[PDB]
Amino acid sequence: QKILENIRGIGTNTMTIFNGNGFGDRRSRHIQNLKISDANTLSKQSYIQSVTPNTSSSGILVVGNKSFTSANLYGIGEQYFDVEGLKLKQGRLLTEDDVDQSNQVVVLDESAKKAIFANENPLGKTVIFNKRPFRVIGVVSDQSLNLYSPYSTVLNKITGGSRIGSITVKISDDVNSTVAEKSLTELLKSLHGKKDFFIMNSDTIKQTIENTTG
């Protein structure tokens, strides 16, 4: 019943593509070869329902007179909250317009809201990440100071470049997960010119459990 009754809902119709060769290789994970253009091409495959780019940075967040360290700002796609199962609790989520206009808006984690705002109303208030002001537009349920902003805003204004840490894809409901992984792998290899990424999904978890000593 281990694999059974468990992988339920984790990486079933979603796959996350990461830089490098695996978690058993932190080194290769630092090299960023995934690009927004990769994500654009993926968004166009017929077997792909949505694509969410993901980059992040950990820095100093000022709120009013308070200063916090190791606040994580994620630059993610519009579909991020849905695919990760984060429930909107208050205000609003990112829109296509936020992404398109690279708006400095942020969506707070439940525990981030509590840590930074306690019982205060967070909506409409400004938080400053590494000197850059963002307006709080909403709050979601959590997965340690997580803030979510459009990937475009974070790339354009914070990290620079068009390279990212990972891409989560939502697979078409009516396609064979194994076939989708293969097409996705072949396309990205073609794009990058080499296999310098790895894919995490239900199959990966299962394959890990099978190959561990019990």
Overall description:
This protein is an alpha+beta fold and 214 residues long. It has one domain (1-214). Helices cover 30% and strands 35% of the residues. The chain has eight helices and twelve strands. It is globular, with a radius of gyration of 18 Å. Keywords: Antibiotic resistance, ATP-binding, Cell inner membrane, Cell membrane, Membrane, Nucleotide-binding, Translocase, Transmembrane, Transmembrane helix, Transport. One of its GO terms (biological process) is response to antibiotic. It is found in: Cell inner membrane.
Order of helices and strands: EHEHEEHEHEHEEEHEEHEH
The coarse silhouette is: globular
Main β-sheet description: 6 strands, mixed, barrel
Q: How many structural domains in the coordinates?
A: 1
Q: Tell me the radius of gyration.
A: 18 Å
The strands making up the biggest β-sheet line up spatially as 3-4-9-6-8-7
First and last CA, distance: 14 Å
Roughly what percent helix? 25-40%
Periplasmic side: 1-214
Family: Belongs to the ABC transporter superfamily. Macrolide exporter (TC 3.A.1.122) family.
Protein name: Macrolide export ATP-binding/permease protein MacB
GO molecular function: ATP binding; ATP hydrolysis activity; transmembrane transporter activity
